[PDB]
Amino acid sequence: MNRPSGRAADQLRPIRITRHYTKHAEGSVLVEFGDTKVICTVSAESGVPRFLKQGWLTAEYGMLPRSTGERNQREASRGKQGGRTLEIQRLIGRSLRAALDLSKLGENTLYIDCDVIQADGGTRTASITGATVALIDALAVLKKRGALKGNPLKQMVAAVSVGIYQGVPVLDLDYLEDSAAETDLNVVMTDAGGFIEVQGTAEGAPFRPAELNAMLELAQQGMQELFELQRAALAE
Amino acid sequence: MNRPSGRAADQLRPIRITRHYTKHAEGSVLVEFGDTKVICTVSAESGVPRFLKQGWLTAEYGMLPRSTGERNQREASRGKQGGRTLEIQRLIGRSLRAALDLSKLGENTLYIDCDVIQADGGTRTASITGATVALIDALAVLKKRGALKGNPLKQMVAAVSVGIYQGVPVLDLDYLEDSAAETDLNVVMTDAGGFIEVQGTAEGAPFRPAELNAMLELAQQGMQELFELQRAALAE
Amino acid sequence: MNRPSGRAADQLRPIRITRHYTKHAEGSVLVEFGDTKVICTVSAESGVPRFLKQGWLTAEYGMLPRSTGERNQREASRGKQGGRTLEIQRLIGRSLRAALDLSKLGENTLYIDCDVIQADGGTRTASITGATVALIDALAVLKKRGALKGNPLKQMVAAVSVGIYQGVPVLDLDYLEDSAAETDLNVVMTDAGGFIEVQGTAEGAPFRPAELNAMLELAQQGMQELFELQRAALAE
Amino acid sequence: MNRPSGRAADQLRPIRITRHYTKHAEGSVLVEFGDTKVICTVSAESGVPRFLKQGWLTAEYGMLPRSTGERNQREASRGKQGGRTLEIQRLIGRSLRAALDLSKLGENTLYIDCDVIQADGGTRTASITGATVALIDALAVLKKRGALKGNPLKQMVAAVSVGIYQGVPVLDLDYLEDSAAETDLNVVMTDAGGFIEVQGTAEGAPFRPAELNAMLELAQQGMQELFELQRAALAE
Amino acid sequence: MNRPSGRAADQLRPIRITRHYTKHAEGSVLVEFGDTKVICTVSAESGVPRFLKQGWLTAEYGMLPRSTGERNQREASRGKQGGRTLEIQRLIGRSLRAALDLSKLGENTLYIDCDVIQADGGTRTASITGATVALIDALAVLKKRGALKGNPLKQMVAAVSVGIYQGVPVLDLDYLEDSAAETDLNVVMTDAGGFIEVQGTAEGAPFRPAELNAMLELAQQGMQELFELQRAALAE
Amino acid sequence: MNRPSGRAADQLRPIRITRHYTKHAEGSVLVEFGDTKVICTVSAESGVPRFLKQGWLTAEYGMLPRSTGERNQREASRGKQGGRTLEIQRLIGRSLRAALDLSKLGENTLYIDCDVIQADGGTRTASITGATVALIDALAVLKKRGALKGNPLKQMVAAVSVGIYQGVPVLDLDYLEDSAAETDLNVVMTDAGGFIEVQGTAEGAPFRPAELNAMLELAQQGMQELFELQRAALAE
């Protein structure tokens, strides 16, 4: 079993999170999972949709037409967001809201925008891992503006994928591996080691209990390195 | 812990699958998970999208405007299918294709249409469980027409949900339970006991390993009753 | 002249109206005109569009993808309602509003949803005939809730079609007859024997006065059986 | 009973048909029904949609934003054609195809475009009456080009409306009358005096048999003047 | 160098502006630049979009399907306005607003609708030149209604094009010339001889300074005749 | 007159062009005009739209939701590209095609994608200036693949804007200046000093001849520095 990148089965790709990446957002990060590069921004808006309950957070995902090996059609000109985009967006939104105590956010709405500049697998996991850092920077801004009702950060959140490649569970899939793997798992967890999201899919041979547990265990292991990178970035 | 329906935590709702429900489809079933009633039809078409590889199977999901407690906007007049619909459709399509050896299906395309007539939770799981029966009836039709290349049925597939209600994992959620539960799990498995799909989401307290395993174990248990019902229906 | 179904020229198909068909709507009926099966629900909403004048009633029509012999494209995924759908919807809305004294309905809006589960001609006429029964059940609900300003039911309404098949006017067309007939008539009438809608179209030989009168007379005749069925259903 | 225009109940508005109105179309007419002014063009195209059977004819309807008393939203910017437009378009298409022996049209497709420059009721009837003249001019062009298979003109077609105003059936409704009338009738007939289309609708008191016959008789009467105007225009 | 129309390089096409063309608009003009015929209407509406600052003016452009040599698809049925339409609309809106002191217009919104009945080049320039006359008629109406805050007419505005045909700058391009020319210029100026819009584009040989100045000088020259025609029309 | 950035009236912002920016495109550049940062990629595709004549080149423009001071709605979710986007896209496409001898490009189609990562005025001019460099890199790739018919590069192309700020013509506008200026000019020129595009617009006081010439002269002056930067980047 030899991964295309020469990486070991339990080895993450080189990762880097850069804060204050673009100048307008209350929070802006360039997150890099190897060749996967995504810009995640957080935009604070006054008011809320239809609540009286707490604040709100919603997310959107986008890809540059040639962030991919083969050009992908611009959803703007096709006049419609595909199933994949909607799936990834919802995931991001759920994941980030799970990290917040919306009642302490105030009557504000946070807009998360994750745009893939260069894709090579795991854009959704990189997006969540990086968006969390951007989110924290944004909360510091709103706190400064005295627009919050306490510290809404419940707990850090990160994500990573796992897939069966050459019959072996490998961590943090790149495009080639994801294209070849018929069985994969996307996981979103917190600092406390709690799962907020687990999604496993099998196109051919169904994955059995031990198999799933094996993938789950590999993901948790690598999750620790991600939280570390997030903290390091926030302390830099 | 008392479920709204008075059902035990490990008890499925009354279930029934009726074949040859509507007269035009090559396969048509009315599947009932308690008050959740869905019509699942299979439409065989000659030819395939863009392949040379095998046949194909794709699925669509729909709900009647008042199949729900509160009227839901007709996607046709809104001129767009929402995120939920796209999510459910993709799941159904993946699940049913997993049940087939597309290479033995021939140069044909199977259209799966799952429409909710009355909803009360678990429309996607009922849809998959019932669609499989409809799919088998459809394969018998194509076989008769001598349009297949062997028996494409790899293995039966069924689905069920599980959620944390009143701090307890309960099987086959109705609308009230799903509305209250912040942690749930949707699972799609096969006869051999293999998973083809596992999706767990937590909006509040993240679910821990044992918790997930507990939900997974409850789902598998109830999955056996579903395969039984499917066989009984096909032998009737 | 032998109709495909073996039915006489002045014979309606077997008809049945089932009330309280699905559990959420204020009114819900399964109406059956032979093999044509439509679910008609009525959804009461507080308030009105842009009036100060009276209540309101609007209708929508839909078909399951395989409610037809040949699969029809789901308007939701095509992202647009076709001409036929809009035509049928408007007809239903006009027909049902004609049955009401909107000034006695109160500041409420009634949503009529007619979805074809199985089609075999006359879906629009079955829809109107059945929707009226559902509408009455809904009015009883609003009356109970003390949300009305008197009894808004002006008069019962029903509908039926007529077409020239094999050179002979035949009543209540099925799909085969409608497909073959180049001259047809759709009629919507009331208890008092008044017309609220008359639509005759000829694709080939134009229909002459006597011809139209003949079709009109045949429709009125069969209309009496429909009002009878509606009353019987409401008294059951 | 005094009509707004001072016109008698059986009196048509001043009518005029001008051929070769705009220079690009194979047929182009400005038809005027009083203050209702519509430009009807016919565009000949080589080939056909999906036939092997005959030629084809399809129609489209449009209104200038201020062809109406109150500005109406441009369907182009709303990105959608309303129910009214689709209804009128289909009617026009059916009406004009009824006038043709499509088998003698050849493998060609005729595009009918009816655009209202100034509206004051009866735009659809004026459209049909004028489009027929444009259609004939277009057929002469294709005949000259030797693109036809004989003379496809089966018979002239014209249209007019009738409505109950002040309790009296009046011929050729203007906007004010149509706005006030709760009962109206649109009719499309041929030279031979045959009906190709009859549509009567009642919003309040249903119209009875004699009433309908009365409206029908008034329409036929005025139809003769229209065929006369069409012939006069074609002989000019 | 011989222009298709036999016109000299510095000669405008025959031009005519007819006011009060259609009866509903507060301002309505038929403007004719040779075979290019456009109807320009102005619709006054009470209130404004999102301002507190002044009134507003916005414009829309449309073409009849066969106003062109070859039928152009109706944007209404395509459900979208093309790039060309949006470009022309914005230009018209900017041009006409430049002619107004919006602060003296009051809390009103003017809707400009320019629809091409017959096209032969320069529809956008004819549109602006004619819309200005319609705009003035509309202002007189609002003034009469005492809905204005003074005279908002800052200065008359007109437009014309210039292009390199056969290596020579020619004024007011028709369709054939515009189709052949790789270098053209559209200009919008005022009475005082000031430019509000200048747009030059070269598809092949880039145009040099002197070349541009030459085109600019030719346009200004012909602009005087246009202002003359506008005044003559308003004094008629 | 003091520009917000402290820049002189004839001083360009700091500019930088980085080639091979993202790894998938045949050409990819990050172009920076001060705080305006745009990624321009070129995607080579085999074949052409509807030609037999030469190759083709088309362009698309996009902005990240928070590439702007205030979040701008994602066109993908709005399901439509605004007027501004279409305008900029067309400009880019025209500009880049002007730089090519499409007959020497072969039966290929070049897709230009310009996405704004951070905006601060002049995104369209930066886009064109940078896209040209990306285009050249892409041509070298196709030449290597032996897919071209000679060297299609006719001449380098660059662009810059000019506007009246504080009554003075200033070069290369940032967002603040563009927001304040009522008179601006966008220009696209070639190496030979030829204009391929000139667009001047005035919202208030119309710009006179000398004024336009002054802006034009300032633009040409700064254009030389841009061609220099492009060459330097290609020789690096």
Curated annotation (Swiss-Prot), chains A, B, C, D, E, F:
Alphabetical GO biological process terms: rRNA catabolic process; rRNA processing; tRNA processing
Superkingdom to which the source organism belongs: Bacteria
Reaction(s) the record says it catalyses: tRNA(n+1) + phosphate = tRNA(n) + a ribonucleoside 5'-diphosphate
EC number assigned by the record: 2.7.7.56
InterPro entries documented for this protein: ExoRNase_PH_dom1, ExoRNase_PH_dom2, ExoRNase_PH_dom2_sf, PNPase/RNase_PH_dom_sf, Ribosomal_Su5_D2-typ_SF, RNase_PH, RNase_PH_bac-type, RNase_PH_CS
Resulting phenotype, residue 124 to A: Still forms hexamers, wild-type exonuclease activity at 30 degrees Celsius, significantly reduced activity at 50 degrees Celsius, binds pre-tRNA
Binding site for phosphate: 84, 122-124
Keywords: Nucleotidyltransferase, RNA-binding, rRNA processing, Transferase, tRNA processing, tRNA-binding
Impact when changing residue 74 to S: Still forms hexamers, no exonuclease activity, does not bind pre-tRNA
A Pfam entry, by short name: RNase_PH_C
GO molecular function: 3'-5'-RNA exonuclease activity; RNA binding; tRNA binding; tRNA nucleotidyltransferase activity
Family the UniProt entry places it in: Belongs to the RNase PH family.
NCBIfam families (alphabetical): RNasePH
Quaternary structure (record): Homohexameric ring arranged as a trimer of dimers; dimeric protein does not seem to be catalytically active.
The protein's role, per its UniProt record: Phosphorolytic 3'-5' exoribonuclease that plays an important role in tRNA 3'-end maturation. Removes nucleotide residues following the 3'-CCA terminus of tRNAs; can also add nucleotides to the ends of RNA molecules by using nucleoside diphosphates as substrates, but this may not be physiologically important. Probably plays a role in initiation of 16S rRNA degradation (leading to ribosome degradation) during starvation.
Name of the molecule in the record: Ribonuclease PH
Organism: Pseudomonas aeruginosa (strain ATCC 15692 / DSM 22644 / CIP 104116 / JCM 14847 / LMG 12228 / 1C / PRS 101 / PAO1)
